[PDB]
Structures are given as structure tokens and as C-alpha cells.
Amino acid sequence: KREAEERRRFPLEQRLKEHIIGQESAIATVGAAIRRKENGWYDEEHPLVFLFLGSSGIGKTELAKQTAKYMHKDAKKGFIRLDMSEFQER
Amino acid sequence: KREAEERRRFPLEQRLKEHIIGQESAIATVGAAIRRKENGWYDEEHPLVFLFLGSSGIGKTELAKQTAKYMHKDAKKGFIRLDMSEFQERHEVAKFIGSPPGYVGHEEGGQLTKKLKQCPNAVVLFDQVDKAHPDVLTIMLQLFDEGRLTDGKGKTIDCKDAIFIMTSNVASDEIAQHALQLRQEALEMSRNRIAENLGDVQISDKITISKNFKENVIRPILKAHFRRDEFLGRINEIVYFLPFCHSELIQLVNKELNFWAKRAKQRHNITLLWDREVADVLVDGYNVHYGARSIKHEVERRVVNQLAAAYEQDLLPGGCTLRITVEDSDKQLPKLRLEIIDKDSKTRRLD
Amino acid sequence: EAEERRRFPLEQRLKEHIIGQESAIATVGAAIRRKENGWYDEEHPLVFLFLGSSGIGKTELAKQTAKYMHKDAKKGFIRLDMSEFQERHEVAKFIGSPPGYVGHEEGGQLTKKLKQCPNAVVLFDQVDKAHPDVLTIMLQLFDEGRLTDGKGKTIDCKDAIFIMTSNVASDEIAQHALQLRQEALEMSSDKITISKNFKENVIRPILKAHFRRDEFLGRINEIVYFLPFCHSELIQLVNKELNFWAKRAKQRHNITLLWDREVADVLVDGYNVHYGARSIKHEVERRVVNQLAAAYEQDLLPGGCTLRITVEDKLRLEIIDKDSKTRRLDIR
Amino acid sequence: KREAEERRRFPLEQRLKEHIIGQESAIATVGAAIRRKENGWYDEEHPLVFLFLGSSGIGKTELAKQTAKYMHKDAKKGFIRLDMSEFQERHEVAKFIGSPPGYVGHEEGGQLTKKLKQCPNAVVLFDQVDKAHPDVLTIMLQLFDEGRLTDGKGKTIDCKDAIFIMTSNVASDEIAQHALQLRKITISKNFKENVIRPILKAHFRRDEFLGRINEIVYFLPFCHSELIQLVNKELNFWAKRAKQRHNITLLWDREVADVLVDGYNVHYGARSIKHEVERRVVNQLAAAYEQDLLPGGCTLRITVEDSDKQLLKSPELPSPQAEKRLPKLRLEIIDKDSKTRRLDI
Numbered sequence A: 001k002r003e004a005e006e007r008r009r010f011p012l013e014q015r016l017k018e019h020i021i022g023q024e025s026a027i028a029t030v031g032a033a034i035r036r037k038e039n040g041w042y043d044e045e046h047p048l049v050f051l052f053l054g055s056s057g058i059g060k061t062e063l064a065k066q067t068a069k070y071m072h073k074d075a076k077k078g079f080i081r082l083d084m085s086e087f088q089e090r
Numbered sequence B: 001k002r003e004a005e006e007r008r009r010f011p012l013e014q015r016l017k018e019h020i021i022g023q024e025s026a027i028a029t030v031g032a033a034i035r036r037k038e039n040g041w042y043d044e045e046h047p048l049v050f051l052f053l054g055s056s057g058i059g060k061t062e063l064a065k066q067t068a069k070y071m072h073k074d075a076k077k078g079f080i081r082l083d084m085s086e087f088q089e090r091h092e093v094a095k096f097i098g099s100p101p102g103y104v105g106h107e108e109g110g111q112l113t114k115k116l117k118q119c120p121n122a123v124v125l126f127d128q129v130d131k132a133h134p135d136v137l138t139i140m141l142q143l144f145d146e147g148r149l150t151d152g153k154g155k156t157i158d159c160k161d162a163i164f165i166m167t168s169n170v171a172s173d174e175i176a177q178h179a180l181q182l183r184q185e186a187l188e189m190s191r192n193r194i195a196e197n198l199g200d201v202q203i204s205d206k207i208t209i210s211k212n213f214k215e216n217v218i219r220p221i222l223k224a225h226f227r228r229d230e231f232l233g234r235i236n237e238i239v240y241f242l243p244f245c246h247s248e249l250i251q252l253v254n255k256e257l258n259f260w261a262k263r264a265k266q267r268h269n270i271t272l273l274w275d276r277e278v279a280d281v282l283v284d285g286y287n288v289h290y291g292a293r294s295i296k297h298e299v300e301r302r303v304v305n306q307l308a309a310a311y312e313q314d315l316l317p318g319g320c321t322l323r324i325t326v327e328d329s330d331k332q333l334p335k336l337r338l339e340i341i342d343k344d345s346k347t348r349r350l351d
Numbered sequence C: 001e002a003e004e005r006r007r008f009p010l011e012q013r014l015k016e017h018i019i020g021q022e023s024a025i026a027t028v029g030a031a032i033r034r035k036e037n038g039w040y041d042e043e044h045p046l047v048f049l050f051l052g053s054s055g056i057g058k059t060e061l062a063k064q065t066a067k068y069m070h071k072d073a074k075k076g077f078i079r080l081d082m083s084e085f086q087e088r089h090e091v092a093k094f095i096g097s098p099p100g101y102v103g104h105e106e107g108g109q110l111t112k113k114l115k116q117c118p119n120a121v122v123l124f125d126q127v128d129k130a131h132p133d134v135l136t137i138m139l140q141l142f143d144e145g146r147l148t149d150g151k152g153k154t155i156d157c158k159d160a161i162f163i164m165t166s167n168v169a170s171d172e173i174a175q176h177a178l179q180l181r182q183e184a185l186e187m188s189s190d191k192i193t194i195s196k197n198f199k200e201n202v203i204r205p206i207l208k209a210h211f212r213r214d215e216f217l218g219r220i221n222e223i224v225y226f227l228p229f230c231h232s233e234l235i236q237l238v239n240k241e242l243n244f245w246a247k248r249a250k251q252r253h254n255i256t257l258l259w260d261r262e263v264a265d266v267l268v269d270g271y272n273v274h275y276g277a278r279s280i281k282h283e284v285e286r287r288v289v290n291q292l293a294a295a296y297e298q299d300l301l302p303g304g305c306t307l308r309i310t311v312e313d314k315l316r317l318e319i320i321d322k323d324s325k326t327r328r329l330d331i332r
Numbered sequence D: 001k002r003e004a005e006e007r008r009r010f011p012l013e014q015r016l017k018e019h020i021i022g023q024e025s026a027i028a029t030v031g032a033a034i035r036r037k038e039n040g041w042y043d044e045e046h047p048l049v050f051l052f053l054g055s056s057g058i059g060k061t062e063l064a065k066q067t068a069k070y071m072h073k074d075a076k077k078g079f080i081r082l083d084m085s086e087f088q089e090r091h092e093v094a095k096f097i098g099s100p101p102g103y104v105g106h107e108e109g110g111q112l113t114k115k116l117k118q119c120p121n122a123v124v125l126f127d128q129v130d131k132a133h134p135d136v137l138t139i140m141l142q143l144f145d146e147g148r149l150t151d152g153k154g155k156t157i158d159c160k161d162a163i164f165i166m167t168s169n170v171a172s173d174e175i176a177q178h179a180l181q182l183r184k185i186t187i188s189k190n191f192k193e194n195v196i197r198p199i200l201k202a203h204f205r206r207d208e209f210l211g212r213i214n215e216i217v218y219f220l221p222f223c224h225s226e227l228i229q230l231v232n233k234e235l236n237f238w239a240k241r242a243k244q245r246h247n248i249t250l251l252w253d254r255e256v257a258d259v260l261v262d263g264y265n266v267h268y269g270a271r272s273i274k275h276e277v278e279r280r281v282v283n284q285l286a287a288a289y290e291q292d293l294l295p296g297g298c299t300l301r302i303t304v305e306d307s308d309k310q311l312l313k314s315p316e317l318p319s320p321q322a323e324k325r326l327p328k329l330r331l332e333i334i335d336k337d338s339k340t341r342r343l344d345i
């Protein structure tokens, strides 16, 4: 019951702005969609599917890592990273 | 007898229509085939098999799911969902049937074999059947033709009265393009008939694909993709899924907003209302290359983010009434705003 | 004897000897209290299935329970390890050999142990590792408490208590507790509760994918879950291990040991989520006690002295004299 | 003459219905075969064979025990129970016959041989016959070839007047959903022919063994009204135990029976409903006595906690991360002033 009050105290838009500066539209979009998920006002029958198009080394992996760190205390188990460059063949 | 009276009263076609919208020819074809099977005289020597052709957003898999909801009360047991996406190689056919003697997993058997062994009358759905390897369709040949499947242990399973549904998405661009061309030609003809004062004939809203199109362009595309004419020959019904109309788009957005309002009323007891310009704006956020999924992921970026972002500010009490309106500053161009209506018909804007 | 059980309920003894698991201890205590009141069905023994991760305390809970019911564990505690019973023929270690064969006169091991004490608590430890056929052997032992030996003899154990510890559905409940670690700790008494529909909608597919028999799971009376350790439970575990070592030192050579509130944080920092209480146990055993043994060989610890564990501004052992002067110990 | 008079007065089906409920087709079938036995109009050269099939906790082995109790007053002497679970290997067949003359323990003989020598008319229950090796049952039909088994010492035993009941759990699934799809409700003959027969012939691997069986008996899982009747019978049993041990009278509502039938699993059988009765009613029912909150002669009623009633009356679909709380049964001492006194420990 205290989780909504904690997020009212420190929203993830401020946490992500502290971690990553710039691209506040991306921060606002991911924060709004995550807020819909974690509030419960979200269709559970489909997962939350983000696509990020960016330049090389702009902080997208850092953004997803900080999102997973905010969502889960353990980022070793609560976060999965996969490199699609290795998976060329079927 | 009582099941016959239930079928005569409420067929599956009304269940499909109240569950999913549009697709009247598709619902007619599938319900007709179920009508032939359930009437107690269908040929048990061959099972019913369907191939669905349509674009990305149109619910072919949703239609199959509601068909299996009709056919069996247990969706988890009587309905076997099976994705063809992970059957991308020839050795993936092992997962279809099992393993030969002397190999690992031979004692476990195969997945579709034992799942058809548990119930023979199952609705078996193959999602993305065009995206599997053709040598996996090769084993689907003798499954569809006579209803017999051979296990890895020598067991033969009769799926003789089963129903097989395949969902594929090849030739979707050509189907959508020709449907758009037919609809614009019919709209030009109907507008010319309106301007020439012909309104005494009931212009029914049903535009159908000819047999000549079905043989001339769709058939060589299917023959080039599936590369076996016997696989297309075993399929009993080929069912097409036409792209959504404008009134179908309106019906879809009201169905989704009614789902949201029903969820709010049965979870937090909040009533919400929409206007005609709001619905027109929500139809305007549609992508032609997709379908209902485009609406299903733009409503939350247009509407439900403003509902959820208002919800941590404690601005939505119990039993309150909300109305969504097009923005008066953005009526010229395009955003939506919540507006809580009090008992004295006064309106409050949510910041 | 109601006065003795009112003086010492088993929940007090269990919390005295094992920490955490406020729901599992209460569940086994309620079942044992139902046995103690004399209103259990006398035809059916008690069967428990423990679901918990590594190093949580299931085997220790069974050992402490059987220490309560029977004073001697050599007679009243029968523990069989299912790590032997990986094959189909290992069944013949329960019952005797068929007549005319090798070891037929040796008899059944479980029948002999149940004949020595029919009231004895039986622990089927690590029933994950058993063959599925051994499960069907002890099917009748859970159904009626009656087992037939190889000589035609038949033993009755209707009054006995059957405990099984398992590892099969240990991940998922932990994952469930993961959201509870983000809910019950953020609910701030406060408790960690496993939902009632979980045991029938998700756990039963793992139990059916592993044990494969409906009758085996139907014969088990109670399914007892074990939850992963929280932060305060890890604090209490660190203080319990340090108090065990301090009590051992005071019993052995009268050596007083002190740790502040700040010391336990760097010991909780040495913890694996995949491991359990044994990780904290041997981390305490390695980081602290090795310096104590090295000082005890070097005659640097006379009896009656007071020692303090201090975090570096390493866990340094500092002698505290009566004049409040810290003295570092130089260990070679 | 007295036996025919008591068979006319109290046939065994009424005693069965007093002891076990439901399964009236199975009760009628086994009872009719026993009526064929007890009037003397039965062929002695083929002793009566029952093959009981059902799910777990559906009513098989307790029915076999009640048949043993009806025929034999001394069940420990005149009723032989063999668990086919131990006979998972071929060499466990040596348990049946005893040793050859000289090998380790030879004069002991088979346990079946001695137990049928002591009573040739004893009812014999091979229970969980599906747990046995396929080799073992290929000995077993010789015990139905002429009703004779030969010991290693040559001590042949004649058991013409025996009743051979084998319980199993083969092919119980589609039998259970076939009984579910029909909601007297009995199994059809077509389902007995084209479903369970090839599975039985393939599992036993010797179809002459299926030739040896006189009657295949099919059990069906529980409907709602008989599940409530199980709740009433179990609370009657526990209240009767409280009367003959401490003089405690219990009262339970129809909402109480609805709550206890809400906690039921189909696959686990009546053992699941028995465990949830024991974990909820008996638990606080004895926790009150641990504090001596129930004096002798007191009268109690069972109520439900008020929170979960409004959840039960509204059947809404829950989320996979939702937590469903069980309705909690509370004890109330019902006073003579038409007043209730709750118990909170």
C-alpha cells in the first residue's frame, strides 16, 4: 500500500533524469507506460513491448539497466541481456 | 436434442460476433463448417482443416481462440495452441512426433501426439504456419488427410474427428490492396448511384473476393511459399480476413473503450463516457499496414496514460463520472482531456 | 500432560532453535497440536511435503520436530535419504529381498526400523532425487501406514509421522516471494504470505511433472512451503551464528566475544541468494573463526579476556581491557 | 434360514450406503455379483473376479475393505490384502510361491499360500495392480485358471470360494471426464468398448488375463450434492468422536458446507476434502480445547468470516498475481439465551 506513495515521493522520471540526462521525451514515455503497468491499470493479457531506435552508445542499455534496477533489486536475476549480433544464423 | 435446441437458438456465429467484430464472411464460413460437423452426420473419414489468410492486426488467432472456446469448455485441455515459429528447421519435426528408439526423450513421446491422445476431438491451432519450414508442413500432410499420426514409439493416434486451424499471414499485402481497390470502386459506384438518385435498393455492405482472384494471384503465392500443391489440396476451407471498415474501426474503438470502462467499473467503480469526435480521433490513429493492434497500442498512449497519470494524484473518487473530450485548443489540428462531471452538471478539468 | 505442553508449546522451541519461517513453523505446529489433542484419525498417519530452496531449514525443521516427539533419535527418528534411490531396483532397500535370493534373511531396512519404533518420525530426505517407482512403493505407506516385508511380515505405522523435504517447486515460490520481497517489505505486524490458489494452479503442474501420480499427492496431508530469507532474518542468522561461536568459546575457554550493530552488515554482504543459511554459516566460520584459531595456537588469547570484532576504517579482532584501550592482534 | 432372512431384511448395499456414499452403479454391480454368490447359483470352477478402475480417492479400496468387513467378521484373519506395488520386479514373484526346496528360506513358503491355507474362502485384494510388473500378472491368471496356486513344496491350495478384487488406476482420466461430460448417469457401452478396452489390452499385454476377469467395475468422480453429503458425513463423524470422547455437539451451516465444497480438487479425490476438513474445522476445534475453552456438554456452531463472503458471492476473474484468501471458519459457543460467543486465540 506504500508503493504508490513512494512513487509519488520519488517518481522514476526523476530517477532516470538523475541517472541519464537528455532525451526527456523517451523518459516521459517509458515512465508513463511503466506507471500504467505498475498502477494495475493495464491489460495483463499482453506484455509491455518497447522498441528504442537510437545512435551508437547513446545510453539505451543504460536506460534499460536503470529501469530494471528500479523495477528489481537484483539485476542479475530480474534483468536479462541478449546480444542479437551473435545470433545471425537460424 | 437439448444441444440441438441450443444450437438452433444460439449458434456459434452470434458468440463469435459478440466476441469479435467484423469478419462476417469469415464467421459465416467457419460457422457453416461447424454447422456441418455438429449436425451429427459429418464424414468421419477426414477431419475439418482451415487455413486463415489475412493481415497482421485482424484476429485470425482470436477467431480460432473463440471457436475453441465454443467447441470445448476447457480452453486449456480441449484446445491445443501450437506456434509454428519455433519449427523453423527440419529436425524440429521431432518435437512434433517424438524421438526414434535409442535417443533421448524417446520415453516422453511427442507433444502434439500425446495432446491429441488425451482428447481426439481437440481444436488444434497452428499459429504462423507460413513461417515454419516446409518439411514441417510435410508431416502435417498425412495429419490433415486421414487423421492418423504416428508416434515415435510405434503408436498411431486417430485425430479423425479433430478440427485443425492454421493461421498464416502470407499474401496479406495483396489481399489488403485488392480489398481496398474493391472498396474504393464500390464507393465510387455507390456515390455515383447516390448522385443519380438510386436509393430504392438496399445497398448491402458485403464485398467478396471472386474465385478468379483466389485461383489467379493468391494461389500461386501460396504455391510459391508452401511449395507443395498437396498441402494446399488437403486444406478444406481457405478463409479470408478482410481489412477493417470505418464503421468497423468505430466498433473496435468502442469495444476497447467499453472493455476499459467495464474494467474500471468492476475494479474501482468509475464510470467513463466518450463523444463522437473522441471516437473519430481514436479511429484517426490507425495504421493501414497493421490492424486492431495499432488501436490496441495507441489507446493507452492517447487515453489510458491520462487516466493512469491522474490516478496517483487521488483525483478519482469512488463513483465519480468522467467524460473524455477532444481538446478545444487542439480541435483545429490533436489531444484528449479528461473532464469530471459533478452532480450539478459542472465540469472539472484534470491537470 | 497438558500443563507441560502449555508451558512449552513447540512453536516456542522451534523459534528458539530455528529462525524465520513463521508460517511453516505455525503449519507444522498446528498439525502436531492436532496430533497432540488426540483428535486425529487413528487410521491415517501424518504426511508432509516440504517445498523450499537450498539452505532454508527443512531438514533441520524435521530433525528438531523428531527431537521433540522422541527423546532418542537413534530409535524415534528414521531418516532415509532419497539420493540412493535414483534407480528402479533401489526399491529393494525398503523391503526385504524375495525368498531364495541374496540378503533375504537380512530383511527390510524400513520394516525393521518401523518395527523397532512404530511411533517414530520418518524423514524421506530430498525426495526430488528418488525414482518415481519408489514413490509408488511408499504410496501404501502414506495411504494406510502398512508395509509388507519380503518374508511375508507386515508392519503397521498408523501412529507415525511422515516428513518429506523436496526441492522441486523451490524456484517459483521464491520468485513469488520475490514480488513479496517487493511487496511485504514495502507494505511497511508485516508477514510474507503465499496465495492459496498458487498451490493448486501452478505448483501442481510441477508436482505432476515430477512425481507424475495423482495418488501420491492426494495421499499427502499437508504441503508446507519455505520462504527465502529476508533482510532481518539474515541479520538474525548472522547474530545467531556469532552467538553460537561465542557460546562455544565461553563453554570452552571462557572467551567473551562482542560485535556491534554495524558489524553484521558486512557479513550480510557475504551472502548468495542461490545458497542458504549454510553460506552465512561458513562465511562466519571462515572470516572470523580462523583468526580466533590462529590466535589460539599462538597463545595470544588468555582465558577471561574480552574480544571485539571491528570493521576496518577487514574484520579485526581487538582485545578490550578494563581500561577501555583497544589492542590490535598481530596474526602471523 | 437366518442368512436368507437377513439377506432379505438387510442386503449389503444398504450397509455399503451407510459406510460409503456415491458410486451406486459400482455398488449395484458388486452387490449383484455377491447376490449371485450367496444364493449358491455360481460356478465354482471360476471364482468371482472384480477389476476396480477409478481415479485417486474415488472409492475403490475402501469399498474392497467394506466388502471384506461384510463377508468376514475377522478381517485380519479372513481377508488377505496384497499390495502389487512391491511386485515391481519379476523376482518378487518368488514372494508369491515361496522358495524352491533348499534355497535360503525354503520351509516358509509364499505368504499367499499360507494365508489362503488358513482361509480358502478369504477375499483377496490385489490393490494398485497397475504398479506391478507385467510379468507378475502372467502368473496371476493361473490363480484364475482353475483357482489354484502351487507352492514350491508342492503344497497346492484350492481357493474356489474366494473373491478376487484388483484395484487399479489405469485409464482413469478420460473415464473421469466422460462422467463429467454426461452432466441415472452411468458409463455407456460404446465408451467401455472403444476406449478402455484397447488401453487395458495394451497395458496388461496378455488379453487372456482380461478373459479371466468376471467383471470390470468403473468408478465416477463426485457430483456437488454427494460432495456436500461427504462434508455432512465427515462432520457427523467428528461430532460423533467429540460426543463419545468429550461430549461436544457441533452445528454447521449450509454456507459452511458451501465453503468446504469450494475447497475441493477433482484429481485428488475425497482425501483432499478430508484434509481441508481436518486443517480447518479440527484445527481450531482442538486449539480451543488446548486452552480448555470448550467445557464438557457445551454446544458449538460453525460460522464464516465476513470478509470473503462478498468475494465468493461475486465471481470475478482474478489476476495471476492476485492473492485469494480462504474464508475462515470460526467457532461460536451457542448460549441458551440465543446468543453467540466467539473464540479468538
Ligand SMILES: Nc1ncnc2c1ncn2[C@@H]1O[C@H](COP(=O)(O)OP(=O)(O)OP(=O)(O)O)[C@@H](O)[C@H]1O
Binding pocket: B019, B020, B021, B022, B023, B054, B055, B056, B057, B058, B059, B060, B061, B062, B063, B128, B167, B168, B169, B292, B293, B296
Ligand atoms: N475483429 C476483431 N474484433 C475484436 N478484437 C479484435 C479483432 N481483430 C483483432 N482483435 C484484437 O486484436 C488481437 C489480434 O489478434 P491475435 O493476436 O489473436 O491474432 P492475429 O492478428 O490473427 O495474428 P497475426 O499476428 O499472426 O496476424 C486479438 O487478440 C484481439 O484482442
Ligand SMILES: Nc1ncnc2c1ncn2[C@@H]1O[C@H](COP(=O)(O)OP(=O)(O)OP(=O)(O)O)[C@@H](O)[C@H]1O
Binding pocket: C017, C018, C019, C020, C021, C053, C054, C055, C056, C057, C058, C059, C060, C061, C165, C167, C237, C240, C276, C277, C278, C281
Ligand atoms: N532457519 C534457520 N535458522 C537457523 N539455522 C538454520 C536455519 N536454516 C538452516 N540453518 C542452519 O543451516 C544448516 C542447513 O540446514 P539443513 O542441513 O537442515 O538443510 P536445509 O536448509 O533444509 O536444506 P537442504 O534441502 O539442502 O537439506 C542447518 O543444519 C542449520 O545449522
Ligand SMILES: Nc1ncnc2c1ncn2[C@@H]1O[C@H](COP(=O)(O)OP(=O)(O)OP(=O)(O)O)[C@@H](O)[C@H]1O
Binding pocket: C215, D020, D021, D022, D023, D054, D055, D056, D057, D058, D059, D060, D061, D062, D063, D064, D065, D167, D169, D230, D269, D270, D271, D274
Ligand atoms: N465411496 C466413497 N465415497 C467417498 N469417499 C470415499 C469413498 N470410498 C473411500 N473414500 C475416501 O477415500 C479414501 C480412500 O479410499 P480407499 O482406500 O478405499 O480407495 P479409493 O478411494 O477407492 O481409491 P485409491 O485406492 O485410488 O486411493 C478413504 O479413506 C475415504 O476417506
Ligand SMILES: [Mg+2]
Binding pocket: B060, B061, B062, B127, B167
Ligand atoms: Mg495470431
Ligand SMILES: [Mg+2]
Binding pocket: C055, C056, C057, C058, C059, C060, C061
Ligand atoms: Mg536446513
Ligand SMILES: [Mg+2]
Binding pocket: D060, D061, D127, D128, D167
Ligand atoms: Mg488403493
